[PDB]
C-alpha cells in the first residue's frame, strides 16, 4: 500500500521551519498581549458537552455563550463582546443543567471583572471605582476559567447500607428486554389496532 504513483516529488512538504514558526507565533502572542494589556489575551468561553455517544462523557470549551445564558446572567448582548465574552447565537439550551452551569460561569466572571471608565474624569455607576481598580489580574481566561472537571469522577465510596437493589430481573435481562421492545414497537401497535378494529366490528 504505497501511494507513490503520481508525481509526488513536486509537492513534498518538509517542516524545517517548525522552530522558526514557533518563535514567530510566540512573538505574535507577545505583541497581541502587549496591545491588549491589561485585558486578557482571549475571550471567555462556555462549557459544552461533546456530541456523539463516544465523546458525550467529556466536557470542553465551546464557541460562545447563548443569548438565554446572557439574559439569565444579566449581561446585554451588545455589552458582552466588549468586555471579553464570546457570544454564540446558534447554540441553544435544551436542558437546564448546561444553562445553569454557564450562567454561574458568567456570574463568576462578572464578579471578578474590573471595568475601567471610558473617561477618566467622569466615572459612571456601572464602572469600577479607582480604589477597586487595583488588584492582581489574570491574562489567560483559558487557564483561569478553564474546564475544571472534564469527566465525571470515576471513583466514589458509599456505605454498604446504601448499596442499590438494582434493576429487577437483572441488568443483562433489562438490556435484552429494552432491545426487544424497541425492535417490536411497530408489530405490537399493528396487532393492537387490528384487535381494536375487530372489537369495533364485532362488539
Amino acid at each position: 500500500n504505497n501511494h507513490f504513483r503520481k508525481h509526488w516529488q513536486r509537492r513534498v512538504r518538509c517542516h524545517f521551519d517548525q522552530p522558526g514558526k514557533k518563535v514567530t507565533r510566540r512573538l505574535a502572542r507577545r505583541a497581541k498581549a502587549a496591545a491588549l494589556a491589561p485585558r486578557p489575551v482571549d475571550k471567555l468561553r462556555p462549557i459544552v458537552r461533546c456530541p456523539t455517544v463516544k465523546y458525550n462523557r467529556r466536557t470542553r470549551l465551546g464557541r460562545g455563550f447563548t443569548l438565554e445564558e446572557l439574559k439569565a446572567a444579566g449581561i446585554p448582548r451588545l455589552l458582552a463582546p466588549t468586555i471579553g465574552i464570546a457570544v454564540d447565537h446558534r447554540r441553544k439550551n435544551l436542558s437546564e443543567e448546561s444553562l445553569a452551569a454557564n450562567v454561574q460561569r458568567l456570574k463568576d466572571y462578572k464578579a471578578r471583572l474590573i471595568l475601567f471608565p471610558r473617561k477618566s474624569n467622569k466615572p459612571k455607576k456601572a464602572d469600577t471605582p479607582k480604589d477597586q481598580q487595583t488588584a492582581e489580574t489574570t491574562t489567560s481566561l483559558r487557564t483561569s476559567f478553564g474546564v475544571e472537571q472534564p469527566l465525571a469522577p470515576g471513583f466514589t465510596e458509599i456505605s454498604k447500607s446504601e448499596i442499590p437493589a438494582g434493576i429487577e430481573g437483572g441488568a443483562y435481562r433489562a438490556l435484552r428486554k429494552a432491545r426487544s421492545d424497541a425492535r417490536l414497537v411497530g408489530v405490537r401497535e399493528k396487532r393492537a389496532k387490528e384487535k381494536a378494529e375487530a372489537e369495533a366490528n364485532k362488539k
Binding site: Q9, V12, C14, F16
Partner: protein, 260 residues
C-alpha cells in the same frame, strides 16, 4: 539543485560505427555541441541519485533514554578517574564533585570576566582553562572555508541555579574560552558527555547541588534507574568467603607444562 545537469537539449546519435550512444548536445558553433550530456559519467551532467532535502536529518530519542543518559553522564562526572581519562586537568582540584559557595557567584559577584577567571583559578580549574587556552589550532580541511576555522579543547562546565544565583554569571563566564555554563534544571547531554566520552569536569554551586534532588523528583514519568548489579566490585565478590568456601579445588595453573 533539481535542474542541474538537465538544463540542456541533447539527443543520442543512435547506433553506429563511431561513437558511443550517449545523448549529445545539439547545435553547432561552440565546444559544447556534440558533447555528452545527462549522464553521471559525463562532465557537466547530473549526479547519480541527486541529494534531496527530505532526507531524515533528525533523530527521535525516547525521553526516558535521554534522561537515563543524562543521569549516567552526571554519575560519571563524579568519578575522578574518568575526568582524567577524558583529558581534563584535575590534579589540583580539591574535591570531586567541585561545589563552590553560592555567595561567591550570586548577584554580580562574578559578573566581570576578571572576577570569574579569578574564581576559577582560586578553586583550581585554572590548569584546565589554561589547557583550553593553549590548545587552539587551525582546523584541517574545508571547515575553514565553511565557517569552522579553529578547534580547541573543552573546559569546565559551571552548573548554577537561576533562581538563587541569578544569570549575570553567564555574562561573566562567557568570554573565557572553553568555559561553559548551564542551569541546574536544563542539563545538556551534549555538554555532559562531549563527543560521547564520559567524564566532564563540572563546577557546581551550592544552590544547584541543593536543587538537583528536586529537579530529578519533578521529572514526570521518570525515576532514577535500578542497576542490574548491586555491588560492582568483582574482586570483592570473587574473593569473598561465601564464594571461595564452596569452590572446587583448582584443576590447573595459569601456565601448563608441555607433557610431550
Amino acid at each position: 539543485s533539481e535542474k542541474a545537469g538537465h538544463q540542456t537539449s541533447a539527443e543520442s546519435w543512435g547506433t553506429g560505427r563511431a561513437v558511443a550512444r550517449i545523448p549529445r548536445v545539439s547545435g553547432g558553433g561552440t565546444h559544447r555541441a556534440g558533447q555528452g550530456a545527462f549522464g553521471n559519467m559525463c562532465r557537466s551532467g547530473r549526479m547519480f541519485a541527486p541529494t534531496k532535502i527530505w532526507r531524515k536529518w533528525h533523530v527521535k530519542i525516547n525521553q526516558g533514554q535521554k534522561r537515563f543518559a543524562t543521569a549516567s553522564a552526571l554519575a560519571a562526572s563524579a568519578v575522578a578517574p574518568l575526568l582524567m581519562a577524558r583529558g581534563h586537568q584535575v590534579s589540583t582540584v580539591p574535591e570531586v564533585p567541585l561545589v563552590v559557595d553560592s555567595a561567591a557567584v550570586a548577584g554580580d559577584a562574578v559578573a566581570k570576566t576578571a572576577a570569574a577567571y579569578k574564581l576559577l583559578k582560586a578553586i583550581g580549574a585554572g590548569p584546565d582553562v589554561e589547557k583550553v587556552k593553549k590548545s587552539k589550532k587551525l582546523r584541517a580541511g574545508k571547515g575553514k572555508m565553511r565557517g569552522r576555522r579553529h578547534r580547541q579543547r573543552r573546559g569546565p562546565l559551571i552548573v548554577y541555579s537561576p533562581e538563587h544565583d541569578g544569570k549575570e554569571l553567564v555574562k561573566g563566564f562567557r568570554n573565557i574560552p572553553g568555559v561553559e555554563t548551564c542551569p541546574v534544571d536544563a542539563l545538556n547531554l551534549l555538554q555532559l558527555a562531549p563527543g560521547g566520552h564520559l567524564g566532564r569536569f563540572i563546577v557546581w554551586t551550592s544552590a544547584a547541588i541543593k536543587q538537583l534532588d528536586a529537579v530529578y523528583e519533578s521529572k514526570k514519568g521518570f525515576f532514577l534507574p535500578a542497576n542490574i548489579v548491586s555491588q560492582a566490585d568483582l574482586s570483592r565478590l570473587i574473593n569473598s568467603t561465601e564464594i571461595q568456601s564452596v569452590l572446587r579445588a583448582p584443576k590447573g595453573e595459569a601456565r601448563t607444562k608441555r607433557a610431550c
